[PDB]
Ligand binder design. Structure first.
Ligand SMILES: CO[C@]1(C(=O)O)C[C@H](O)[C@@H](NC(C)=O)[C@H]([C@H](O)[C@H](O)CO)O1
Ligand SMILES: CO[C@]1(C(=O)O)C[C@H](O)[C@@H](NC(C)=O)[C@H]([C@H](O)[C@H](O)CO)O1
Ligand SMILES: CO[C@]1(C(=O)O)C[C@H](O)[C@@H](NC(C)=O)[C@H]([C@H](O)[C@H](O)CO)O1
Ligand SMILES: CO[C@]1(C(=O)O)C[C@H](O)[C@@H](NC(C)=O)[C@H]([C@H](O)[C@H](O)CO)O1
Ligand SMILES: CO[C@]1(C(=O)O)C[C@H](O)[C@@H](NC(C)=O)[C@H]([C@H](O)[C@H](O)CO)O1
Lengths: 265, 265, 265, 265, 267
């Protein structure tokens, strides 16, 4: 929809935005509540404190357009991002009361099992497609879940759409980034499943992701807002005694480089 | 057989087609019926509801040639595709009545085990080669299976050919893309086997596959039809109580970029 | 010692050869006989029907030379190959009488365990080096095995050489491609071992292997013969009842692009 | 803060610094003390001898500026590094009193399990962010640990910062490289978790890491000091009898190439 | 290179040569396998027999003599430009019939060779330089191998006093020596370790892959005294005996094809 013109250069034509997003694993400090499992598909009633959710934030950018009626206006364009999962080294902890290896004689199992890592940078909220494993699930009060009127919600029902517009409220397991939308967002996601799978987590300050599309255009920040989204499920913590499991998530740092872009109003 | 001439440029000379294909795991909503296993190679009678099939669709394109008598005509040429498995994040669900880890105390096993992912874009139906694990298998009414007259069907019998011309009817286990044909289709497949293997599933809107061949020519859409095919087996769901297993499949999104191509009539 | 001159261009100066090789796992239709294991290194008597062998074929090429006595002649030069393992999707079969997962309640184990994949394209037979795990093995009548006079056959004995000159007769376990020869053949092999290892098998029609050497020269077809070789061990099938194991192999398709090359006679 | 001008070339304008850092696994000679595991999150009292720490060193460089009053001065600029984990081949040891495979009949388990590898090269101390798995942990006397006033220390609390300014004193599990700082340091880290995970360790003298940023500027050595940091946890040693586990770390070699850089004083 | 002033490449007829060689593995006995490996019950005494210790393979290949007169202000050296190297006998590990521990509770085939893998090759103009490092400083290394002195526990990490040259085939145990990254200016070495208990070996075999040996300045190893030095180890995992369940290291031979050219240097 937007006719993109030339990059605007000169003093104060570029800025770097730094932010971090703390994980929303179901409680505030990096872990879900002990996860409970239904004995059948119905009733299946996951409590809110047991459901990892997407993290998201809108960063206000410097105001560009005193007059919004001119035939051309300026927009902040996200050119590149350096992003880092913070606290990776915490998973070298094998002393804090996990299930012990070597039949109880060795160290605690580290955080391990399914991993799901996603970050997104856009000029508007991340657009979501609803999809669930079990259409009979009762999602709790306090989360935004797709309506579940029939089993088509287990595959692609094009009626089930949302915008990631609240931090710690959209459960990861019932929403994915919508590939049919997000023209103005770049999202990067990986899932590695299995039971006791080793997490593989890099940490470096040397890797830049370019956000420019095929035509050399980055996300354009509507209303001078930059939208950051992520989830970083790093696996499960097993309690030594109960052997109950908790989702473990880690915070994510973002450094986004932006430039002014002229567009046709 | 088609003499390919120059690309036709100018207004309305390009179009993007967006489509999704819901998985055909043997029932309509992402899962096979509980899979049964023969005690011997004969009789071996897999029910239709237990056999994953290829997904396919023909998308009608804008009509190009009201007059088909000219010495040159136009065909839509598929240049590139962005494709995404939708609902990957549903496999972060460990509460919906799966077999529990840590001897029954931990979370449910996630969907895991053998993965088979394929997508194809072509200007005609995907061409298939018949090949089976067990030539004594009785395939059910309601699926298209190769004739099984002898054990050569377990390897390459060049008599066993078909076109993927019906959605949810050609079982994955008795047909593969025919590498000896498919001049006018690009197909991309991976199988990762094993028992409890971690699924590894990316989800991003930043990856484009170019469909042009060695000569810079993409699939040419015969009769103004674009043909999309896929399968996305993501592993097995284990029922907590029975411990019976179901194939789990996920829907696939396609965005195909096309341009008009002049050809000799 | 062939002096290679210019490529011959013009009408009929290029051709594509298409062929498939059915696997030789010890019986004709993709599986070994149930594999037996010696209780000691001597006697160790593997039956022929239990020993996977290399597949190979010589393709006769079109007549190139109206005269063989001229100071220059033409040879077919193999420039590139597209090759595909056929029937990969058969390994989505979990119903055909394999050992059942989840303590007998789940699906059959898929084909899994050690994988060995090799293809070769040359202008003469693949040259082999003899090497065995157990020099005391008695190889059966009907296979070509290296002489085993001492334990040096377990490492590199340069006296143990052969040419791959018969389909389904040279066991994989006692011959490998000779890196000290094969000047006029390109071979590409991978072994992935272990007990229950997931097979990882791509299937696409989009990947070309270039056969040109450092000097831009492909294999030159001596006697107008193109030589194709492969093995594709995809793992073991376990019988549900006996729990005996069979090698499973899959057929391989080749499409080789050739051009006429002038050489000094 | 530093205005960077041209590279200074000519005789003695470049130097190579070679150094090694011995690992700090909790005792001096490559192993932690046998690791103990709390039965609950509180009390959780890891002894110092059981906590791997970062290695670090400041290397004095040739003094550049006898006169520090000129409008321009020289700084050593770190351009590239070759770095190697030393003693990788020690992990071919299966005789030194580890838990024996094949039910006690086979060789000892090699060093295996979680791996955490990081190296950093900078012109000042590595900047650290505090983050822990368990905010209730009591860190011992003799290590530098972040204050733990609340559970925010399990995620990102921006109040928890430090500089890596003492060798063998900053525990890996409560500090990570701060991605919001370290403008004048390059750090490269990988974590591979799990219980018995195979360590994958290259050793070659052929691989160079370039330390130049986006603008062609390497770390600038403040006070003519080069700062090297690392950790190389290679997994756990299991005692044959007790089955107690010890962290195993290996030393790291650095070769850093530097050049003189003019900067505005 | 080191103290050598390197001048131009010498071209023309006979200015290049290819050296082909193979090195048979030294797993502790001569024919690809260690003796059944024994394990100490404690760190002291820990007495691995020589027949149970994999060692590095190495060879010096004599090259065509270049300088009958060694008094000229410039002389020629053979320069190693590239290598094609292959582990030979990879396909032997498709053997599941030769008396290994049987899978499926005794009903299936024998376990293939599997477990820890350690692969290294080196090409140089002088012997590979080694750094001493051990897992257990209390180990008693046997007569007939060259092991570093073990005076204290620093030998478990980096003790810069513990240095050697790989100057004898089948004598330097892999587990107490690694390539010295602080030396080997005139050698390129390439090593990988993949550990674990029953880990799948992943072994390519192709004749299409060339490793370039030129450094940052376009200079390959220079063959001092017209000698080319080849080193390797290829531990492919363990063989388990069906009855005893004792384990043996399995190693495979390595083939080298090294391309060399004449290089002018200042004498
Ligand atoms: C007793 O109440 C709860 C609980 O444990 O907190 C409530 C919770 O909503 C429910 N969870 C789900 C996913 O349905 C859980 C299971 O039914 C039960 O643990 C199975 O044993 O029961
Ligand atoms: C009871 O009838 C069925 C079933 O359960 O649905 C019919 C089904 O066609 C058949 N499946 C196959 C692949 O042959 C199955 C097995 O023979 C049986 O489960 C083995 O125990 O039996
Ligand atoms: C009964 O005769 C056979 C068999 O089973 O067919 C013959 C076969 O040559 C032999 N296989 C090998 C590799 O030696 C096998 C085993 O010795 C036996 O199964 C051990 O239990 O015995
Ligand atoms: C007996 O004293 C100690 C020990 O073993 O040295 C003290 C040590 O601080 C403590 N470690 C931790 C991480 O808390 C440990 C465990 O509480 C105990 O081993 C559980 O059985 O007990
Ligand atoms: C009987 O003498 C030996 C043996 O078995 O050959 C000598 C050998 O040097 C020694 N190996 C090591 C690594 O120390 C071994 C073990 O001490 C013993 O097997 C423990 O069970 O004992």
């Amino acid at each position: 929809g937007i006719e993109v013109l030339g990059v605007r250069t000169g003093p104060d034509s570029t800025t770097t935005i730094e932010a971090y997003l703390n994980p929303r694993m179901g409680t505030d400090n990096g872990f879900s509540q002990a996860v409970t499992v239904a004995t059948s598909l119905n009733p299946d009633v996951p409590p809110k404190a047991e459901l990892p959710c997407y993290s998201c934030a809108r960063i206000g950018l410097p105001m560009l357009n005193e007059d919004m009626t001119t035939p051309e206006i300026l927009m902040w364009e996200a050119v590149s991002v350096k992003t880092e999962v913070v606290g990776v080294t915490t998973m070298c902890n094998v002393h804090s009361a996990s299930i012990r290896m070597n039949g109880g004689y060795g160290v605690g199992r580290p955080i391990e099992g399914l991993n799901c890592h996603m970050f997104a940078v856009g000029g508007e909220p991340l657009e979501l497609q609803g999809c669930v494993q079990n259409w009979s699930t009762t999602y709790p009060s306090g989360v935004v879940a797709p309506p579940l009127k029939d089993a088509k919600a287990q595959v692609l029902d094009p009626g089930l759409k949302a915008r990631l517009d609240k931090d710690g409220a959209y459960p990861v397991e019932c929403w994915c980034p919508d590939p049919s939308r997000n023209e103005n967002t770049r999202y990067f996601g990986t899932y590695t499943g299995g039971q006791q799978t080793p997490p593989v987590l890099p940490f470096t300050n040397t890797v830049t992701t370019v956000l420019l599309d095929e035509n050399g255009v980055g996300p354009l920040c509507k209303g001078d807002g930059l939208y950051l989204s992520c989830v970083d499920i790093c696996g499960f913590y097993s309690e030594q005694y109960s052997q109950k499991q908790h989702f473990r998530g880690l915070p994510r740092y973002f450094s986004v480089s932006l430039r002014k872009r002229l567009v046709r109003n």
